[PDB]
Amino acid sequence: KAKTEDFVKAFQVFDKESTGKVSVGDLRYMLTGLGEKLTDAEVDELLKGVEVDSNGEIDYKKFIEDVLRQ
Template sequence: MSVPSSEQLAKYKQSFEEFDNDKDGFIETSMVERALRSIGLNPTADEMNDIMSDISNSNKLSLNGYLYIAHHVGCYANTEKQLIKAFTLFDRDGTGKVHKDVVKDILGKIRRPLTEGQLDQLFQNLKIDNGFVDIKQLAKALLSQ
C-alpha cells in the first residue's frame, strides 16, 4: 500500500475531527462509514463488514485507526478506478461492457495469470449478457478475489 499524501492525511484528519463530537480523540465506530462517505470514499458493504469486524472489540476508534482505514479504502477505490479505465480501452462500443473472451485473454496473459478455475469462478459471480460483462462489476469482482 502506498503512503498517503499530506493532502490526503489532512482530508482524513479533518473528517475524523468533524465526527469526534466530544473532542476526546476518538470517534464512535458506528460513525466510521458516515465519516468515510463524507470525504467521498464509498466502501462496499463487504469492506464495511471487514472493517467493523476488525474494530468490533471496541465502540471507539482512534485517529490512527481511522487514518489507516481511510487510506486502505481510498487505495482500493483508486485500484478499482484503474481497472475500470484499463478495461474501458477494450469497450469498442462505449457500452461499459467488454466481451468475456477478451477478459479471459487479458487475465490469461498478465504477469500472474488466472487459472481456468479462477476464471470460471470469476464469471460465475458476474452477470453475462450475450457474452459481455459489465466493466464496473468486473473490477469489483477482481478486487474481491
C-alpha cells in the first residue's frame, strides 16, 4: 500500500513557513486531490470529534493518522 510519506509530503509541502497547522478548508481540499473521496455526510461524522481552535486551524498530521487507520 502507500506509506505516511505519501500523505506527509502532500500537506507539509504547502507549509512554506513550517508551522505545523492548516485550515480545514485547505486541508480537506488537498485530501480530495490526494486520493480522498469522502462526502460531507461521512466527513461530518469524523469531524464530530475534531477540536478546532479559535483561529480555524487544525493539525494535518493528526487527522491523517486517524484516517490512515481505515
